[PDB]
Structures are given as structure tokens and as C-alpha cells.
Ligand binder design. Sequence first.
Ligand SMILES: *S(=O)(=O)c1cccc(COc2cccc3nc(N)nc(N)c23)c1
Lengths: 288, 287
Amino acid sequence: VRLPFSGFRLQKVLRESARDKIIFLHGKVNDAVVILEKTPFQVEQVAQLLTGSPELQLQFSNDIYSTYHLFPPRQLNDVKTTVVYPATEKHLQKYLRQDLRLIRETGDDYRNITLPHLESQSLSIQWVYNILDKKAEADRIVFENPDPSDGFVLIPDLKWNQQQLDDLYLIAICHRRGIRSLRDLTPEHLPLLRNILHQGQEAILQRYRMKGDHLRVYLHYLPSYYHLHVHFTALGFEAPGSGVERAHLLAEVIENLECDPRHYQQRTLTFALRADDPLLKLLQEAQQ
Amino acid sequence: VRLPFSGFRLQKVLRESARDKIIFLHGKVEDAVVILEKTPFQVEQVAQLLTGSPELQLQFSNIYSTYHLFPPRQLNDVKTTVVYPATEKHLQKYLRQDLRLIRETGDDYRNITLPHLESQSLSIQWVYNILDKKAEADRIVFENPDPSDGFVLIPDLKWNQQQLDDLYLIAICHRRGIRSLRDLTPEHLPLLRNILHQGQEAILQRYRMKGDHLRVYLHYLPSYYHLHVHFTALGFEAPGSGVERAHLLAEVIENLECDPRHYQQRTLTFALRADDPLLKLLQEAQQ
Ligand SMILES: *S(=O)(=O)c1cccc(COc2cccc3nc(N)nc(N)c23)c1
């Protein structure tokens, strides 16, 4: 009916979504958070104003094409205003999205900069180890090829509620300890990868009756943790990770290693890093 | 101003993405396709209305409370893209058919895809008109007018230019004839390095946006068969940044440098509409 407080004072923009037409804003009042979402169109309201005389402003016109800047009446001007009053730092945390900067890492950049940095920051992958030795999430196992070397475990991702196929997000993990990232891959890793590709998709087609042509099979680089795991997502589903600056198709990771054996050891890989991430500056610096 | 024609008569709705806040509509006027996109917010025009007295209508209250808001004219902008006239080829590209992934080997292109595309793809003419400065001439941000190794940097139709967040620009090569990523040989290497570096530098001058904030990719399979390079803002969830379509210019160059016959022989992955006939031609060639 109005405002919960008295006046807003914009401090920082928590999150942004230009694709989704939404804005997330933090503000001090009398702390609180305000969210604005541009409402999606209504078939009837739009068609009705179209057959009439609307306000149009020509941006440009080339060939059969032409764009306009439009201003519709009150009924089509709705915006979703979600207000969270009050809010704290444990809410600013999982609701703010940081700046992203792209970096191109040479064969040598990894060897001499990235890898020694990663060796410094003691990462715990005990949760993975526990999944592999069936100590944890044992029930969720969809498939397992228990070969110690060429073997893997196919489990559905934890955020997938498994109530629909549309958002199918499964994640395989190789049994062989030691493969940190996509950079540790040599032709000796080729059979373990082919099993994860074909054996995984077949486990999926048996358990979920989902054909290979409906599946995106990719690897992340730089990954969230350093122990080779492959993503298996439903094709129609678009979820941060399918982005060209991070995803590497298993189909091609295999075709590449088949052609150039030393490929992922020497070839320059592109990925983004958080502005706050210290590694980003270490590479920016090594490259000047 | 008003529409290019006289009155609209809605036929069918091509696409309606509630997540993207966009509507695709077909209407007889002859034929005409109209697209409406709810414009993404602008830091300033939002912050300014916030410190004031806005129109709010309580939907619900928990401490979770939602409101229905009505902002002034400036914040009421909608992107109205009109295609007049719209052929049956326009009326199919914009529908929503189930996506199926396909892997094209070197020979699959040579023997199946390429002869299909030669049968007919799309009218380029809008591109030609931009390149010959017949159209959108003023909007050109950059040009290296070399006939072979030259290009043109113009911002995308899919960009209102009112914010950096959704930055979408293009780099159309001046050299007519390069259809897709598959037409690329070492002779096109200087042409690409020109669109890589020269492009980013025309962006950093006009928009003061550093290279580290930019996604420079190529599409495969593309919307039109005449080599064009996408230049998108990194934070922007750009429709086309998907691994099953995008190819980073940085790497297209690196792969060409290594294997000269790379994009002519190497197996490329891309998705196709269930309705797309090419999809079936490859599915069939592979059985
Ligand atoms: S059309 O069917 O709407 C279509 C088919 C294939 C590709 C496109 C690309 O977008 C444009 C078309 C015409 C003009 C234009 N001008 C500029 N500067 N950028 C773009 N991106 C387009 C449309």
C-alpha cells in the first residue's frame, strides 16, 4: 500500500540480471534490500494496444528491419517490487554477485603461476572421497563403473530436486584420485573419459529415458574444486556453467587428446575470475 | 511516429519467454512480425525514483513483502523490433522447437550441411547495406575499411545502448564470402586478429570497457551466413554464450595457427530445432 520505512539511500547494487530484466539493491533506511523486476508481457494487453496508435520512436531502419522505443499505458507498466526490511551481512553474502574478469592462461602460466598457487591453498576434497568410498550420499548413486583407474560414479546434482527432466543436472566423478583439473589430462586418461561419456549417457538413458541428443556433456575450467568431475545437463536448461568461458565439451576434450597428446598441458585456456580473487592479479602481474 | 504499415491483426504468438520478459508476435497488415522486450533497469533512473515517493500496491506480507509498482514515462521503455515484410522463413526461426544436439564431422559439412545451405539459407542484404553504409551508417562505432582484412564494428539491434550491463556489439568483415566458422583457413588469420584487437580497442575507446570485461565469440551454426563476431559484456548471460554454439575468437585464431585445416576437418557440435530439416538430414547421414 506504501513503503515499510521512510526513504531509501542506495549504498551498493547487490546483484544484476540484464538478460532477466531484474535489479537487486541494498539500502540504509530510517539496513534493508529492494528488488525490482520488469513484469513479463500479457498476450491480450499487447495485441489490443498494437491494433491502435501507440507511442513509437525510431531507433534505426535497415532493409525490412526497424527498431522502436515504445511507451505503453499504466496497465502494461507493472514492476515487481520485492522489499526485505530488515537485512544483515549473512543476507548480503548469498544475495550479492561480484565483478567478473576474463583471463587467458598459457601452458606455462599454469605450470609457473596457477598450479603453485593452488598447491599453496590447501583444498579439502574429503566430501568427494567420502562419496567415492560410499561413506556419504551412497543412496543417490545412479551409476558406477567401479574400475579403480578407468572407473567413475554418476550421481545427480544436489540442487536438482529430480521432480522433472527439464532441469536435469547429473555429475560424474572418476574413481581415480589425482586428476585435479582439465590440465592434468593426458592420453592415459582417454579410456576413463570415454567411459564417463558413453557409460554415463547410457546410465541416463536407462534411468531417465533421456537420449544423448538431449544432453550437454561438459567439464569446467577453472573448476569449483580440483578432482575431475563431468557435468551432464539437459540441453534446454541454461544454468551458469554452460558459458563458453568455462565449459569444455567431453566429446571434444577426448577428440583433442586423440589429436594433440600434450594439448591440455600446452594450449592456452580462457576462463573468468572474481575481481576479489588473488590469482587473477597474479596472472595479470605475470603477464606484465 | 507510428508502425511501418496500417494496423496489426495478430495471427499466432511465435515465442513467449516469461523468464526473459519478451514476446514474439506475427500479424497480417501482407505479413509483419513484431517483437516486444521489457527494457532492463538503469542504476540512475531507479535510484532517483527510490529516494522519492513511488506508487506501490501490496501483493502479500510475511518479513517477505511484495509490491506492484507503476513508474514514470522514462522507466516505461519497451524494445519494439518490427520485421515488415516477414516471410515464412522468419515465421519459423522464431518458433520454439525442442532442441536436439548434433556433431558434424568435417565430411558431414562437405557432403550434407554445405550443399543444404547452398540450396538456400537467409537474405544477407541488411548486412550488405550496413557494410556499404546504405543503412545504420551513423551507429558505426568502428571501421577498418580494408576490403580483405577489414571489418565494421556496429552495436547490435538487441541493444538499446542505455547501459553497459547488456553490452552487445558486432564485427562484420568487409570481405564478402566467409559464410561460417567452417570457411576459415590461415589466409583469414590477419582478418580475425583485426576483429579481435581492433574491435576491443574501439570498445575501450567508445565505451571505456577493458578487454577483461569482454566475451569475444563466433556462432556455429549462425543466424546468417556471413562471418560476424559477437562482442558481449562478460556479466551478461548473452543468448549465444552457450558452449554448444559459441567459439572464442582468441581460440579460433590459436587453433588456425596450430592446425591450418582445423575448422575444415575437425568435428563441430551445435544444437538444432526439432522442426529444422537439416537436423534430420544429418541424423539420416549418420544411419
Ligand atoms: S531477422 O529474421 O530478424 C534476423 C535473422 C538473422 C539474424 C539477425 C540479426 O540481427 C539484425 C538484423 C538486421 C539488422 C541488424 N542490425 C544490427 N546492427 N545488428 C543486428 N543484430 C541486426 C536478424
